[PDB]
Amino acid sequence: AGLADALTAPLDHKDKGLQSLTLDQSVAKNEKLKLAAQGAEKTYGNGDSLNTGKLKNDKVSRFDFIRQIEVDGQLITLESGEFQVYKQSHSALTAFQTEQIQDSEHSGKMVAKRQFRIGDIAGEHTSFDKLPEGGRATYRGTAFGSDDAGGKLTYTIDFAAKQGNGKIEHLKSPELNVDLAAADIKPDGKRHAVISGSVLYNQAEKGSYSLGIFGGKAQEVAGSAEVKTVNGIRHIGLAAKQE
Amino acid sequence: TLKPCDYPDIKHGGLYHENMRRPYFPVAVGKYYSYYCDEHFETPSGSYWDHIHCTQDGWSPAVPCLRKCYFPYLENGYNQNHGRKFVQGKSIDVACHPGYALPKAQTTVTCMENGWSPTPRCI
């Protein structure tokens, strides 16, 4: 699996890409993230890198997480649960499956609350100005929500029209098997190629989706979707690669 | 027609995945995005994160991030409310031990946008 190696072993250039993943949105500057798996343990670290090179590609890597803060020289637990990592060749994304949190009414109490949220979406960002001038590209991968990593993602990009559209299939929750509506590729603040559009279920708008284009030759897409269901809003992790 | 919502400048917070979302604003009525609240601030639901919706009257909730004040330990006062969370605008009485009192003959502390006013401390 390589879960223990990802936490203990240093960064190696011969390892399968994506080799490194900077934890920015996963760990805030004031807090600490303690990860544990296969008897190993490591603490991060806003800006610290996760050794993704030791993890397996096109799969979800699972770790036990503890969100800590230093109060009186000691680390105090604020939030705990499962930390999910989906690794690709030029992209990677993090997800948090919360199981426990600090009581909203009391600082010294912990309560059992379940939440699913996407942390980081990073890798080798494709420049909007370096995108292919034309042609169509099909991306195949995984769509992952709370307690379900079995979802199938299909996404198509028309480089001539600078547009993208997709679909989510096979998730246990039928309402999450949504259509990712036609959306334009736009440059971000750093001029990286990004895509944001509407989420549709039975031709009705249920939310939004966002994707980042990754790799020198636009090989991958990674991002998330936020979908309204009968029992509330549910988040889905998105990652797909070209064949 | 209904006015589209411009990028939301959430006081004491902001939107997640800012880089991917920002180039697509203004957004149509009905659109919603997951947002966070800064340290010492929370959502009306009592969490560090929730969803902000673009309605006909603008962004909902209007005040996405409210101040959260945790009642501190009183060295020389009664500690029944120690660690208890209080949202912005809410007040609580401070009971000090005999021979001790608040900054200036005060008895009540209020959780403002900046924190406790006055500071809850017995002498």
Numbering used by the authors:
A (entry chain D): 79 to 321
B (entry chain A): 321 to 443
Sentences from the paper on this structure:
Factor H binding protein (fHbp) is a 27 kDa surface lipoprotein consisting of two β-barrels that promotes resistance against complement mediated lysis and is a key meningococcal antigen that elicits SBAs. We have shown previously that fH CCP 6 and 7 (fH67) are necessary for high affinity interactions with V1 fHbp, and that these two CCPs are sufficient to inhibit binding of full length fH to fHbp. Here we characterised members of the three variant families by identifying amino acids that are critical for fH binding and through structural analysis, to inform future vaccine design and to understand the basis of the interaction of fHbp with fH.
The structure of the co-complex of fHbpR106A with fH67 confirmed that there was no significant change in its overall structure. For instance, Ala substitution of Arg106 or the corresponding residue (i.e. Pro106 in V3 fHbp) reduces, does not affect, or increases interactions of fH with V1, V2 and V3 proteins respectively; our results with V2 fHbp are consistent with others showing no effect of this residue albeit by ELISA. Previous work indicated that V1 fHbpR106S exhibits a degree of enhanced immunogenicity compared with wild-type fHbp in mice possessing extra copies of hfH as well as endogenous mfH. However we were unable to replicate this finding either with the corresponding protein, V1 fHbpR106A, or with two other non-functional fHbps, fHbpDM and fHbpI311A, and did not observe a relationship between fH levels and SBA titres in individual mice. Immunisation of transgenic mice with the non-functional proteins, fHbpDM, fHbpI311A, and fHbpR106A elicited similar levels of anti-V1 fHbp antibodies as determined by ELISA, demonstrating that the non-functional fHbps retain their antigenicity. The non-functional proteins also elicited SBA titres (measured using human complement), that were similar as raised against the wild-type V1 fHbp. Therefore non-functional fHbps retain their immunogenicity and elicit protective immune responses.
